[PDB]
Amino acid sequence: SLTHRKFGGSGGSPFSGLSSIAVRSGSYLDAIIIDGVHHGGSGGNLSPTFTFGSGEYISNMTIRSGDYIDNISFETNMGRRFGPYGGSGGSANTLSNVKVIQINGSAGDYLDSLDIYYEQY
Amino acid sequence: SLTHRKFGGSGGSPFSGLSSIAVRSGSYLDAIIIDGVHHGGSGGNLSPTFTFGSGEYISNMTIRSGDYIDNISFETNMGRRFGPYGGSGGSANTLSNVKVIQINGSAGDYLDSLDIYYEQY
Ligand SMILES: OC[C@H]1O[C@H](OC[C@H]2O[C@H](O)[C@@H](O)[C@@H](O)[C@@H]2O)[C@@H](O)[C@@H](O)[C@@H]1O
Ligand SMILES: OC[C@H]1O[C@H](OC[C@H]2O[C@H](O)[C@@H](O)[C@@H](O)[C@@H]2O)[C@@H](O)[C@@H](O)[C@@H]1O
Ligand SMILES: OC[C@H]1O[C@H](OC[C@H]2O[C@H](O)[C@@H](O)[C@@H](O)[C@@H]2O)[C@@H](O)[C@@H](O)[C@@H]1O
Ligand SMILES: OC[C@H]1O[C@H](OC[C@H]2O[C@H](O)[C@@H](O)[C@@H](O)[C@@H]2O)[C@@H](O)[C@@H](O)[C@@H]1O
Ligand SMILES: OC[C@H]1O[C@H](OC[C@H]2O[C@H](O)[C@@H](O)[C@@H](O)[C@@H]2O)[C@@H](O)[C@@H](O)[C@@H]1O
Ligand SMILES: OC[C@H]1O[C@H](OC[C@H]2O[C@H](O)[C@@H](O)[C@@H](O)[C@@H]2O)[C@@H](O)[C@@H](O)[C@@H]1O
Structure with missing residues (x-):
């Protein structure tokens, strides 16, 4: 809901x-x-931190995904712009003309999944 | 949307x-x-920090408000339970049997407003 x-x-x-x-x-x-809270394993390389300015939000987003998140x-x-970070596995999904509100997900040794809550324009 | x-x-x-x-x-x-990120002015007293355990979320919430947020x-x-924190002014509203996803708002010297994104059950 x-x-x-x-x-x-x-x-x-x-x-x-x-x-x-x-x-x-x-x-x-x-x-x-x-x-600043970590979810997932210790593998790979740590990216720069993207910090949103005042009134700045994610409007466009691309995720590759199979059993895990492959790329974002x-x-x-x-x-x-942030990324792309990750590999070429998975299939691409794109959110266009959105305002992302929250990013939840699930994570083991890897980032299994992402639940993006957003507004669609 | x-x-x-x-x-x-x-x-x-x-x-x-x-x-x-x-x-x-x-x-x-x-x-x-x-x-950890501050939104609002320097007044009042700082509460302890409530940190969500795994799969823990806000299911019920009372906020008193008028021109500002009086109490949460x-x-x-x-x-x-977290709170109540703040004073006696304003008028009470409750969210009940929800799952809060995100807390946005507006702030100056004080917490002017909360924009709560949630799922209603
Ligand atoms: O992001 C996943 C891993 O990406 C890189 O590892 C590639 C492969 O390396 C070895 O073949 C095995 O460890 C495989 O499991 C892995 O896919 C590394 O950056 C690694 O640290 C990452 O965890
Ligand atoms: O999201 C990661 C992958 O998801 C799918 O599964 C591929 C599988 O390949 C092999 O069975 C093993 O290496 C498994 O670990 C792996 O899940 C595919 O969509 C793949 O392209 C993704 O990279
Ligand atoms: O994020 C990936 C998984 O992380 C944890 O489990 C990892 C285990 O996966 C398989 O059972 C084997 O490959 C084991 O070697 C490995 O430790 C769990 O959180 C799981 O739910 C995730 O899918
Ligand atoms: O939470 C807002 C303020 O609450 C208390 O202020 C008490 C009184 O201070 C001044 O007399 C005026 O601002 C009055 O309106 C107010 O009732 C204090 O805790 C203060 O530090 C807070 O900023
Ligand atoms: O939510 C704060 C209050 O909002 C309304 O009151 C407006 C006036 O309150 C005090 O007189 C001062 O803070 C003034 O600056 C402000 O204009 C009422 O809804 C009140 O009940 C709330 O406590
Ligand atoms: O958070 C409450 C307000 O914070 C800022 O300014 C305080 C103003 O309060 C009243 O409008 C008057 O007493 C002004 O003199 C005082 O500067 C602003 O960000 C405002 O927009 C907030 O409502």
Whole structure:
């Protein structure tokens, strides 16, 4: 059921809960690091951390996936790019004209899966 | 249009991007701190940090609000409680039998507003 509700008044400036992202990656995604928390194994190489600016969100996103997440890249509403990181296995899926709200998933020694919650425009 | 999609396989342990919450509070919520990141001003007193265990999420939430967020409390599916923190003003609203996915909002000197993304059951 993805829904939302707003509480409170009109002032202040917006913020998002999803503030930064890095991955460890080789032939697949070994890990995803979200707001500085690590999920997945120790294999592969650690990427730079992408930290969202104020009012910046993921608008375009590409994931390769089979049994695991094989690869990820994304772009933001401000033309900033992350990746691609990972291998060529899996099949490509793309999200276009979106605003990503949250990234959940499941992870063992590898990044098994990703659940992306988002708005579709 | 709010949506979600899962990519990849079914192994691994589930994880959420929303891993921890603390607030600064006095009369109002001065700030909320999401995965260590501060949103709001410097006032009030800093709460302890609530960190979600694996597969733990917010299932019930009372927020009092007016022009700002006056008070927050929540219970998780595991029976753990955070708060109440803040004061007596505003009006109460409750989310009940939900699973909160993400906490966005707006903040200045204080926590003006919360935008809660959740699934309703
Ligand atoms: O991201 C997965 C791994 O990617 C690279 O390893 C490639 C292969 O190396 C050896 O053949 C075996 O370990 C295979 O399992 C593996 O696919 C490395 O960067 C590794 O550290 C990653 O875990
Ligand atoms: O997401 C990873 C892979 O998912 C699928 O499974 C390929 C399988 O190949 C062999 O059976 C073993 O190496 C298994 O570990 C592996 O899952 C495919 O879509 C593949 O292209 C992906 O790389
Ligand atoms: O992220 C991949 C898996 O991670 C953990 O299990 C790893 C095990 O997979 C197979 O049982 C064998 O290849 C073992 O050698 C290996 O340790 C679990 O979280 C699992 O659910 C994931 O699929
Ligand atoms: O949570 C907001 C503030 O709550 C308390 O402020 C008490 C009083 O301070 C000043 O007299 C005015 O701001 C009044 O409106 C307010 O009731 C304190 O904990 C303060 O530190 C917080 O910022
Ligand atoms: O959520 C905060 C309050 O919002 C409304 O009150 C507006 C006025 O409250 C106090 O007089 C000061 O903070 C003023 O700056 C502000 O304009 C009411 O809904 C109240 O009940 C809330 O506590
Ligand atoms: O978080 C509450 C507000 O924080 C900032 O500014 C504080 C302003 O509060 C009242 O509008 C007046 O007392 C002003 O003098 C004072 O600067 C702003 O970010 C505002 O948008 C927030 O509502």
